[PDB]
Nucleic acid binder design. Structure first.
Ligand SMILES: [Zn+2]
Ligand SMILES: [Zn+2]
Length: 214
DNA sequence: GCTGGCTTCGTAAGAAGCCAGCTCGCGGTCAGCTTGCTGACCGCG
């Protein structure tokens, strides 16, 4: 297949009703909208799809920021299904709400970058290969392994200093700030300040960006 | 790559081709009956 064969996810109307959802185990009815995470098979050239009912796919941990470019078959879905996948992708769970806005939904947290206190002491900073001690603050750049596709986005941990040294190769653009790391809000104020200090991004204050109202 | 369910061909009886589906392993932190060791959730990649 020329092109259109490297995407990590696929969406389409069930070609049959024999596929079983990898999350709830129930069968996926033919013609129903289903999604799958593509995986390379070591037994033969070709990728095996792990299918899930549309809703189950998001309850396992799979995440997509831009469906049009990350999910194969997206452009061939009916318009309403293209909007449903686009909105579901934006919604990152978390019981939120709304009241006054202009565009639709809003994103303010990276899905491939996280910050948290080491849940244990067997992890290892992938920048200096030194072990991270339990309790120590660590950062990570989510990445998928072609050898372990069933895992999906796995965290690649680093010490905050080591992470900043490789910000470019890790894809941490200069416009991103520490407040965008997944898990930032759960850090003590002291820990949050240290991060904002090394990853400032644009600015810490907020004056305006289009209108004039303090 | 293999399985399997079924559509296509056949004078009929049974046979074949083919679209569609298809998967964590390991280590050990922190506990517990078993008397000196064992158990396993859950963190890691
Ligand atoms: Zn399901
Ligand atoms: Zn390090």
């Amino acid at each position: 297949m020329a092109e259109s064969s490297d995407k990590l996810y696929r969406v389409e109307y069930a070609k049959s009703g024999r596929a079983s959802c990898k999350k709830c185990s129930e069968s996926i009815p033919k013609d129903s909208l289903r999604m799958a995470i593509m995986v390379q098979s070591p037994m033969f050239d070709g990728k095996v799809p792990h299918w899930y009912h549309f809703s189950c796919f998001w309850k396992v941990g799979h995440s997509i920021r831009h469906p049009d470019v990350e999910v194969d078959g997206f452009s061939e879905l009916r318009w309403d299904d293209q909007q449903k996948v686009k909105k579901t992708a934006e919604a990152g769970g978390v019981t939120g709400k709304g009241q006054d806005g202009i565009g639709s939904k809003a994103e303010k947290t990276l899905g491939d970058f996280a910050a948290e206190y080491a849940k244990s002491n067997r992890s290892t900073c992938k920048g200096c290969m030194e072990k991270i001690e339990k309790g120590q603050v660590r950062l990570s750049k989510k990445m998928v392994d072609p050898e372990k596709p069933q895992l999906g986005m796995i965290d690649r941990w680093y010490h905050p200093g080591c992470f900043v040294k490789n910000r470019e190769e890790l894809g941490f653009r200069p416009e991103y700030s520490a407040s965008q790391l997944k898990g930032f809000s759960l850090l003590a104020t002291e820990d949050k300040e240290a991060l904002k200090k090394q990853l400032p991004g644009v600015k810490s204050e907020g004056k305006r960006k289009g209108d004039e109202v303090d």
